[PDB]
A paper describes a structure:
Here, we describe the identification, biochemical and structural characterization of a new D-amino acid transaminase from Haliscomenobacter hydrossis (Halhy). The new enzyme is strictly specific towards D-amino acids and their keto analogs; it demonstrates one of the highest rates of transamination between D-glutamate and pyruvate. TAs catalyze the stereoselective transfer of an amino group from an amino acid/amine to a keto acid/ketone/aldehyde, producing a new chiral amino acid/amine and a new keto compound. Transaminases are usually homodimers, comprising two symmetrical active sites formed by the residues of both subunits.
Residue numbers in the entry:
A (entry chain A), B (entry chain A): 0 to 281
Write the structure that this text describes.
Amino acid sequence: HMIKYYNINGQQVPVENATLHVSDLSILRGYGIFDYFLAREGHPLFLDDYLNRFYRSAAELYLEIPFDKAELRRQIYALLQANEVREAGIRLVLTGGYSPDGYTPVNPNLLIMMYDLPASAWEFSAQGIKIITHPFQRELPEVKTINYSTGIRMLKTIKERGATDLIYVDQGEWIRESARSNFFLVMPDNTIVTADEKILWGITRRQVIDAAREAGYAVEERRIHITELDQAREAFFTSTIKGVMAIGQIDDRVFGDGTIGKVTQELQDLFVGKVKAYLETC
Amino acid sequence: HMIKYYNINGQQVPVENATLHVSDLSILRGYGIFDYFLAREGHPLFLDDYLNRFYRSAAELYLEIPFDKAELRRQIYALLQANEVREAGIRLVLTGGYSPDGYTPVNPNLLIMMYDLPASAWEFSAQGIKIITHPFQRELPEVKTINYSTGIRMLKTIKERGATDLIYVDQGEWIRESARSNFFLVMPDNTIVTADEKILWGITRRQVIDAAREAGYAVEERRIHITELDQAREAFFTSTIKGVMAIGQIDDRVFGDGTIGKVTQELQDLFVGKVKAYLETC
Ligand SMILES: *Cc1c(COP(=O)(O)O)cnc(C)c1O
Ligand SMILES: *Cc1c(COP(=O)(O)O)cnc(C)c1O
């Protein structure tokens, strides 16, 4: 039940022995991709979608995953079994590998790490969070790279300023995403708005959009002007750990009374239904 | 003489045992800074300047280096001594450390790695290299972060296209630097031009500028338009390993007959003199 093992390059290894040699290009060059997904009732959620993303991220960095997707899926199931857990967080990392020259990739290092189910997962607080705008555009935004400098560097500024997250705004004209979350507005006519370009295409994002459309809501995937914050009734984040999370304040703009909006609340319940349905196919 | 040891968190460690645990934020989040400098005759070159840069990079990521600069300088000298080498490459890495939550830094991991003197160091080929333009702007450009995704990802494209390096061009309007080098033009009136903003402030760059000014050349530190490639007689790179390196072709623009330009050649000899002078102070 406590996590006893990780997997490095297809070998189960006690957590206390899970190391990389310092020639690894993630350490020297931040060259890497990753994926992160929850497991509930002994099943990684929406697994084929997270794995297909992981394979697409690897090909963008010209990094070959040593195992095909069936073989990686087996190793993930074997690791859940070996740690004897049903509720977990799971991280896949694929690094540039042990490079001869501290720059050119050779063969990648593959890591499968495992965590308790995050405590906050799908908390679904009724009180929206408070975030700040930050001018920035992520590099290679469509690839899930290991590159979180700006997001991490900003943690002092976020806290200093009374916030618990931020939203990136490309040349401070275009709303994108947080470091770790996709961003949605709900207009007063109940139209759901989210960025279509220069973002990471979240799996959670995909499930909430599909669930919104199935419930008969209008969803626009489009460029979002900074000024549309002024027109929106609601704002929320999506991610693997957040599920759907109500944002109550961006800078001095309070959405409603700061509590979770109507459509936001309906989208939380639909996401929990997307998960329940997923688990019934396993 | 072969490298026997690295230093991790103030402890000398055999190279074969130099590892980090996979919770290190450089591995999970590419959160890190580094520095790299040569040693000749048993002395790291321009050391105080590289160390002051290393300390400035750390403070930008809010990462405290555990030792003051005198103590780090001692550890570097002790490591050269223990490996019994006079000619070396030296890498300092400071990672986000072993984070509890795979995101928030706690205390950093400090690495001192050591290499043979790179074979190519200050090669000073008379034949200029061939590079391509690439549209891109480095994140946090003034900090020497471990984030080289774009530069590394581009290696296939560079080689495919008949090149051995690139030059980054900010919104393809403004000339900046390569992934690993500063970039200079020499105008037909012998004015030396280099970017002043949104670049890493190289140590080599600093020494070549000082040496050019002392020789009585005009040096402009200014924004450089893409179209000024058309006006330049010469182009060169600077970096710790290149020293000064002649660029003979950018895309279909051949500088002269592709061989090292006049001022470029004089700046190579002045840099070797900057190094010789440095070593006489040790
Ligand atoms: C991981 C990540 C997300 C969330 O994607 P999910 O698949 O929903 O967890 C969003 N944006 C960025 C930048 C991310 O790295
Ligand atoms: C390290 C580096 C340089 C070169 O700096 P030097 O101190 O001259 O080696 C140039 N540009 C970038 C982006 C670098 O990381």
